[PDB]
Amino acid sequence: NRKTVQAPQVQAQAQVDSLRDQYYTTLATEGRLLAERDGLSIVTFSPILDAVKDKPRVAEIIALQTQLFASRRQALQSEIDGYKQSMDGIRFQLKGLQDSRGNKQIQLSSLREQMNSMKQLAADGYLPRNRYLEVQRQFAEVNSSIDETVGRIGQLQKQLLESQQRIDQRFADYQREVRTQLAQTQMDASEFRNKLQMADFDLGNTITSPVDG
Amino acid sequence: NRKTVQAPASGIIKNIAVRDGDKVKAGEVLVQLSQVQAQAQVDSLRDQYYTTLATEGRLLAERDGLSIVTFSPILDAVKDKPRVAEIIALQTQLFASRRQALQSEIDGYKQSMDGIRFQLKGLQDSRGNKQIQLSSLREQMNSMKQLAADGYLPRNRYLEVQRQFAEVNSSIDETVGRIGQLQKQLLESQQRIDQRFADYQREVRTQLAQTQMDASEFRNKLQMADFDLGNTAITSPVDGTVVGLNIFTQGGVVGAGDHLMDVVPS
């Protein structure tokens, strides 16, 4: 017993277009971020974006993401490399301090020996015209020198450990940053998706119940 | 009157250059010592010193954003020494890296801001087009007010175009809200660049200060070490003969406060 048509590409198309680039921007940003979250060498973009490279705004936003990705990766790379050679410089300092410490050790044993031989002569009934106290001083000095060198060493070892925790810190900071931006981007991807389903819905109406009779 | 030469440091005399009945030249060498421990200390301080010199060359360049690091001529003069060459290589490396990381970061921020700009372009275009739609709607609402007043369309769909107008407008301000927020993201990201640049300078200026302190500490220490090694070779004060040998102390340990020879002028 009959049906009645009661509903509501001319301007809604514009709305759809507008939501669409914004969305594409989010897709590009998400490809970049996904690549950065994981440890991928190259960004790989959504087939949504992929299907439509030809559009200049799209080609532009992809280029931008490829660049920004490259810049960031180069920067992290160069930073952590910097940390490692900083550590290498520290290790290089450590080596020299150890050389000194050993050579001081040798001077230390030798002082010790001269003190003993003085004591042995004394024990035999011969006391040296030489002053043993002078040697007690040299020995004591070498000893404290050695302590200085050791303290310096401990300091350096602490520094490499701290710098290592610094590296670990900056990877972690990067991870958190990237995951935050990513979740945010994903939310935007979703609000755009849904808004776009709606705009599409609007454009679908321009219409007719049956099409031809 | 007569003065007698005592013993400066306290170590092992390796050789003597004098014996009784032998006159002086003012400042001749009368004794030596092994110098192996004094030579060692000087060497070790020279090493540490050399390390800070490398570092300092790097920091100065990073402070003045020089394109290439340029090292102290001292370092140049002893480049042949393997640890020296080593540290120069490492410092040059560490420089290359750091300048690189900074560039790459700043590039990232400029490209990200360009991304924000690319977004704003689209948003501005959208807003413009929406302004047009707003205008066309208003003119059509007017024409409808006219028909209504004549009696030809009821006021009931006459209200509809006003609904449309309002929706388009509210859409426009959604878009503007986004624009403003983004304009903020530009100011914010820009200040992030600026702040971290300030941070890099602060770090470098500090670290340089540290290095200078160290350089100073080594410099003055080395000066002292050089006094000691220079002092392992004993010299006469007056000008004339020598009296008072302990004939055979050659090779034997000595103390501070020990006078083992005296020198004559008649």
Side-chain angles (χ1 to χ4, degrees), chain A residues 7-8 10 12-54 56-113 115-128 130 132-135 138-175 177-196 198-206 210 212-213, chain B residues 2 4-12 14-22 24 26-27 29-109 111-120 122-132 134-144 146-157 159-162 164-183 185-201 203-204 206-226 228-235 237-238 240 242-246 248-249 251-258 260-261 263-266:
Chain A
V10 273
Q13 179 58 56
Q15 191 65 36
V16 163
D17 295 331
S18 170
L19 292 178
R20 270 176 179 205
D21 52 305
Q22 311 185 58
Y23 184 44
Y24 292 155
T25 308
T26 53
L27 289 185
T29 299
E30 186 177 56
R32 163 179 84 81
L33 285 181
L34 285 185
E36 312 207 296
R37 173 170 79 184
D38 302 9
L40 303 202
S41 49
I42 212 171
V43 176
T44 295
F45 293 103
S46 192
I48 304 178
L49 263 39
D50 185 10
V52 77
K53 357 281 191 294
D54 57 349
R57 295 271 300 173
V58 156
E60 187 172 358
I61 194 57
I62 278 162
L64 207 63
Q65 255 35 265
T66 303
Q67 277 179 75
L68 181 42
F69 175 75
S71 299
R72 291 185 113 217
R73 263 194 100 214
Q74 184 44 257
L76 190 42
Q77 187 65 228
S78 276
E79 202 189 333
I80 67 121
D81 283 348
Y83 285 149
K84 307 194 311 187
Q85 17 219 18
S86 156
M87 289 169 67
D88 279 344
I90 277 180
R91 275 175 210 110
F92 170 87
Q93 282 167 306
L94 278 177
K95 183 142 179 146
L97 291 202
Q98 299 296 355
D99 291 341
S100 312
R101 170 168 147 209
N103 291 6
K104 279 164 188 182
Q105 287 286 345
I106 282 160
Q107 197 54 15
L108 199 58
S109 98
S110 159
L111 278 175
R112 182 164 199 217
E113 168 164 303
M115 275 173 321
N116 272 358
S117 295
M118 288 199 215
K119 270 295 206 119
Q120 302 174 313
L121 266 63
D124 284 7
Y126 294 112
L127 67 94
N130 178 335
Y132 164 105
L133 308 92
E134 174 82 10
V135 195
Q138 303 188 24
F139 176 83
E141 175 198 344
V142 174
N143 205 300
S144 61
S145 167
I146 274 185
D147 273 305
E148 210 176 301
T149 279
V150 162
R152 287 195 56 191
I153 280 165
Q155 270 302 125
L156 292 180
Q157 277 154 339
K158 184 181 94 171
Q159 301 195 5
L160 66 79
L161 210 32
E162 298 182 334
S163 93
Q164 174 69 290
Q165 75 171 215
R166 186 174 162 95
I167 284 187
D168 291 336
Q169 257 297 344
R170 156 78 164 164
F171 279 113
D173 289 10
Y174 171 77
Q175 288 271 34
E177 169 200 0
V178 154
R179 289 181 172 50
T180 303
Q181 300 214 17
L182 181 53
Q184 190 38 67
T185 287
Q186 291 203 268
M187 226 170 293
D188 295 357
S190 157
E191 106 170 353
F192 285 156
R193 244 187 282 96
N194 307 3
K195 285 210 290 180
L196 208 67
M198 281 197 57
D200 283 322
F201 195 29
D202 295 3
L203 183 142
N205 312 341
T206 50
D212 178 30
Chain B
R2 324 143 176 144
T4 314
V5 42
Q6 300 222 327
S10 321
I12 304 191
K14 147 185 64 192
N15 72 264
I16 313 190
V18 192
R19 29 206 159 185
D20 276 4
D22 193 12
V24 144
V29 179
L30 318 172
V31 182
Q32 273 294 355
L33 169 152
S34 69
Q35 317 153 12
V36 127
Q37 318 80 347
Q39 189 57 49
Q41 191 152 262
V42 165
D43 292 330
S44 170
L45 294 184
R46 263 175 176 204
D47 178 81
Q48 311 184 56
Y49 186 44
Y50 290 153
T51 309
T52 51
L53 285 184
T55 288
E56 195 179 66
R58 164 173 79 77
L59 288 184
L60 286 181
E62 308 200 23
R63 175 173 80 179
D64 298 10
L66 300 200
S67 50
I68 196 173
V69 80
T70 297
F71 293 103
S72 192
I74 300 114
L75 269 181
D76 184 13
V78 304
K79 215 145 31 190
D80 61 344
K81 278 19 192 172
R83 293 207 109 216
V84 162
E86 185 174 357
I87 199 57
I88 290 161
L90 204 155
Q91 275 314 307
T92 304
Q93 220 158 21
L94 179 41
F95 176 76
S97 296
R98 288 185 111 224
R99 143 75 62 69
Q100 185 46 256
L102 189 41
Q103 256 310 114
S104 276
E105 204 187 333
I106 305 283
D107 285 350
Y109 274 95
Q111 280 139 43
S112 164
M113 289 175 70
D114 276 342
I116 272 76
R117 278 175 212 110
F118 166 84
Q119 215 151 358
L120 268 42
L123 290 201
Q124 293 291 353
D125 291 344
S126 187
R127 169 168 53 161
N129 289 6
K130 277 164 188 181
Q131 284 286 347
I132 276 161
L134 267 192
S135 96
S136 161
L137 275 176
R138 183 160 201 216
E139 97 190 30
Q140 304 310 348
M141 168 48 221
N142 276 356
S143 297
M144 291 200 53
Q146 305 321 319
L147 269 68
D150 284 3
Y152 284 109
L153 67 92
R155 100 180 181 264
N156 169 328
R157 59 180 60 81
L159 210 147
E160 170 77 9
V161 52
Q162 243 168 17
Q164 303 191 25
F165 175 97
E167 177 200 343
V168 175
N169 205 333
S170 82
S171 172
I172 268 188
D173 279 45
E174 210 175 71
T175 276
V176 162
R178 281 199 265 260
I179 275 170
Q181 296 307 352
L182 285 179
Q183 279 151 338
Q185 302 193 4
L186 266 202
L187 287 177
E188 298 178 332
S189 94
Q190 167 69 59
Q191 90 171 71
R192 286 193 288 267
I193 281 188
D194 293 336
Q195 270 301 343
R196 165 180 199 285
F197 210 101
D199 287 13
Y200 165 79
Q201 284 273 36
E203 173 200 1
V204 149
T206 302
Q207 304 216 18
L208 178 56
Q210 195 40 64
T211 281
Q212 287 210 54
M213 271 172 285
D214 297 353
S216 161
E217 153 179 321
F218 287 141
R219 247 190 283 97
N220 297 311
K221 279 200 203 165
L222 212 173
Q223 183 179 52
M224 284 322 102
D226 283 325
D228 297 8
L229 186 92
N231 244 20
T232 61
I234 297 85
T235 63
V238 300
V242 306
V243 127
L245 311 128
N246 310 359
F248 27 43
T249 324
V253 303
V254 69
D258 292 347
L260 276 73
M261 199 177 51
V263 279
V264 343
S266 288

